[PDB]
Design an enzyme around this catalytic site. Structure first.
Site, mmCIF file in Angstrom:
data_model
loop_
_atom_site.group_PDB
_atom_site.id
_atom_site.type_symbol
_atom_site.label_atom_id
_atom_site.label_comp_id
_atom_site.label_asym_id
_atom_site.label_seq_id
_atom_site.Cartn_x
_atom_site.Cartn_y
_atom_site.Cartn_z
ATOM 1 N N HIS B 41 0.656 -1.177 0.056
ATOM 2 C CA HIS B 41 0.200 0.230 0.341
ATOM 3 C C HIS B 41 0.862 1.716 0.454
ATOM 4 O O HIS B 41 0.541 2.399 0.062
ATOM 5 C CB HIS B 41 -1.221 0.405 1.035
ATOM 6 C CG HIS B 41 -0.332 0.396 2.535
ATOM 7 N ND1 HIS B 41 -0.706 -0.847 3.386
ATOM 8 C CD2 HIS B 41 -0.343 1.321 3.031
ATOM 9 C CE1 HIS B 41 -0.517 -0.211 4.429
ATOM 10 N NE2 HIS B 41 -0.067 0.737 4.250
ATOM 11 N N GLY B 143 2.636 6.304 10.004
ATOM 12 C CA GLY B 143 3.912 5.933 9.459
ATOM 13 C C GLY B 143 4.933 4.648 9.953
ATOM 14 O O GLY B 143 5.573 4.224 9.173
ATOM 15 N N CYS B 145 3.791 1.506 9.644
ATOM 16 C CA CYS B 145 3.200 0.682 8.700
ATOM 17 C C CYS B 145 4.489 0.468 8.027
ATOM 18 O O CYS B 145 5.470 1.106 7.607
ATOM 19 C CB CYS B 145 2.247 1.237 7.387
ATOM 20 S SG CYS B 145 0.869 0.550 7.878
HETATM 21 C C1 LIG Z 1 0.470 1.627 8.913
HETATM 22 C C2 LIG Z 1 0.733 3.035 8.073
HETATM 23 O O1 LIG Z 1 1.503 3.381 8.161
HETATM 24 C C3 LIG Z 1 -0.154 3.939 7.085
HETATM 25 C C4 LIG Z 1 -1.539 3.243 6.668
HETATM 26 C C5 LIG Z 1 -2.536 2.769 7.275
HETATM 27 C C6 LIG Z 1 -2.420 3.882 5.618
HETATM 28 C C7 LIG Z 1 -3.560 4.401 4.754
HETATM 29 O O2 LIG Z 1 -3.960 5.651 4.507
HETATM 30 C C8 LIG Z 1 -4.654 3.081 4.347
HETATM 31 C C9 LIG Z 1 -3.827 1.667 4.533
HETATM 32 C C10 LIG Z 1 -3.852 0.604 4.280
HETATM 33 C C11 LIG Z 1 -5.566 0.686 4.351
HETATM 34 F F1 LIG Z 1 -5.804 -0.949 4.232
HETATM 35 C C12 LIG Z 1 -6.094 2.095 4.830
HETATM 36 C C13 LIG Z 1 -5.343 3.197 4.535
HETATM 37 N N1 LIG Z 1 -0.681 4.933 4.900
HETATM 38 C C14 LIG Z 1 -0.440 6.278 4.642
HETATM 39 C C15 LIG Z 1 0.187 6.540 4.202
HETATM 40 C C16 LIG Z 1 1.425 6.454 4.841
HETATM 41 C C17 LIG Z 1 1.561 5.407 5.893
HETATM 42 C C18 LIG Z 1 0.093 3.997 5.768
#
Ligand SMILES: *CC(=O)c1c(C)c(C(=O)c2ccc(F)cc2)n2ccccc12
Ligand SMILES: *CC(=O)c1c(C)c(C(=O)c2ccc(F)cc2)n2ccccc12
Lengths: 304, 304
Positions: B41, B143, B145
């Site tokens: 992602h 951040g 992830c």
């Molecule tokens: C965990 C992290 O750093 C991160 C997430 C969760 C998201 C995001 O918008 C997203 C990912 C997966 C999901 F199923 C829903 C939402 N991020 C976006 C940008 C940077 C870091 C992250």
């Protein structure tokens, strides 16, 4: 989101752990620059642990009697000295892995990470607090002595604790990195009482803020209190008296959540008077007091 | 003595944390040999997170679009591929700090340490468990992830988890290091239910043994039970059904303490039926289920 009892990454401290053997006693040492710091009870046999004369025992020891081992290599001891309850062994090699460090003496209520070690090898890392009675509730078996407590600020490790003792009560006592014990504890095999352990009120409050931030709000109420009314309740439950400094330090948490500090104090007062009633707060069934306001701010903002 | 929720020393894993930026998204990567592993992602903008076609999104990406940074130096991406929900970035340099490692997929009930990271920099380390519903209860902000879960066996790091998601319930979901999610979770911004979270019975029992070893005995009783009678009680309280394998794994703890496993089961049954009655066990007011029998043996024996 989510709130966990988190320890600092232990890498910078792992690179400082050595093994110090003196006579038949083996414990941990902290190698920073050309000095290995370790508890002075390393020079003791089990007989003289009842009442040691460390100055007299140390006279019988020479540089070559202190065996220092880093992983697999032997360090050469070129000097030795006693500073309060720590021995300082000067080695001929500066630790190449020495991080930027400071030696700090902490106040009760403050938290720190402990890297539990055995034979100079780290087994684990946990977060704990200096209790108001100057003991820590750790996990320390035989051989863990010399394990250190520390904090990290970006790249600088602030060493605050060195493990020396387990009281007959199962609690732990130790020194700062200058060899001065926290509390009235002495490095002797004698009956030492820990003292009344009170709850760190400012920390419970900070944890209540962390709970609100992370979703747990059931404990929030329609009441408020005053510093003196809350402190009457705090005394009854062996809680640390809350001061204006404590209210000030909760300022950033109060501002972020929009909940005034004395309103959170009224929630805590009701939690103390009525219990949790079978409920939990941040996965805990009791009031957690080992998260300082700084820990909560750091964990809820992701300071690396 | 003393019993703490302890994490593995995080040094070996800190030396593997890098920053991976793709487009405007920044998250953590795991650098092992010449490969950086990170969540897929990373190639997503917030719009396409509702329903991404990762294969289609990846087509629009080239080696030069994946920015990998280790501390301060930029790594050169010479290859890229998708393996389930992880991206694998081949860099031109093997990580000099690569520890001896394995990629393992863990079973629910098993515990592991998490090194929470932001911008490839570690902020903290905590111990957690893979819940029976395949979620973890961590502390993960935006951040985080790409932060990994792992175990250590002397010198070999067994990577088991990579953080990808936070469910609307505040719990965390992620993958093994092959990109396969634990549980039915998908890397999409869609309503996903975690499922009934049951308590890990074998772990609560192990923790009861740790409590007896460390002094807490108030919960011990004059009763015994059978696997089927205890499991009737376990079902009623949403506890994992106890099997003969579980009894076998509690063998070393049963032998060390002299308390038969079914006698400890009767203590647990009474704790479930009567509560703690205002008392605590190892400083906890609830039944702790995030210590496996192996964790208790390791902590009570000091395995480094
Ligand atoms: C965990 C992290 O750093 C991160 C997430 C969760 C998201 C995001 O918008 C997203 C990912 C997966 C999901 F199923 C829903 C939402 N991020 C976006 C940008 C940077 C870091 C992250
Ligand atoms: C902590 C440790 O590794 C250790 C202790 C506590 C003792 C010991 O016998 C002792 C020291 C201080 C005290 F006040 C009473 C007893 N050790 C002896 C030998 C190796 C390691 C330790």
């Amino acid at each position: 989101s989510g709130f966990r009892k988190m320890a600092f990454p232990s890498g910078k401290v792992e690179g400082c752990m050595v093994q110090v053997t003196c006579g038949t006693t083996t414990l941990n040492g902290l190698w920073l620059d050309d000095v290995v710091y370790c508890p002075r009870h390393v020079i003791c046999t089990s007989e003289d642990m009842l009442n040691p004369n460390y100055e007299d025992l140390l006279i019988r020891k020479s540089n070559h009697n202190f065996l220092v081992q880093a992983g697999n290599v032997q360090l050469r001891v070129i000097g030795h000295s006693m500073q309060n309850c720590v021995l300082k062994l000067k080695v001929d090699t500066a630790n190449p892995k020495t991080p930027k460090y400071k030696f700090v003496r902490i106040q009760p209520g403050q938290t720190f990470s402990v890297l539990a070690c055995y034979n100079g090898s780290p087994s684990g890392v946990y977060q704990c607090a200096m209790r108001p009675n100057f003991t820590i509730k750790g996990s320390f078996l035989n051989g863990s002595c010399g394990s250190v407590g520390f904090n990290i600020d970006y790249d600088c490790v602030s060493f605050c604790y060195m493990h020396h003792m387990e009281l007959p009560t199962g609690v732990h006592a130790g020194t700062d990195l200058e060899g001065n014990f926290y509390g009235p504890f002495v490095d002797r095999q004698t009956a030492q009482a820990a003292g009344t352990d009170t709850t760190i009120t400012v920390n419970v409050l900070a944890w209540l803020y962390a709970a609100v931030i992370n979703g747990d709000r059931w404990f929030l109420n329609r009441f408020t209190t005053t510093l003196n009314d809350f402190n009457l309740v705090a005394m009854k439950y062996n809680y640390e008296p809350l001061t204006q400094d404590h209210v000030d330090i909760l300022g950033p948490l109060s501002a972020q959540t929009g909940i005034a500090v004395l309103d959170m104090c009224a929630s805590l007062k009701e939690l103390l008077q009525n219990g949790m009633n079978g409920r939990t707060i941040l996965g805990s069934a009791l009031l957690e007091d080992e998260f300082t306001p700084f820990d909560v701010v750091r964990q809820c903002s992701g300071v690396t």
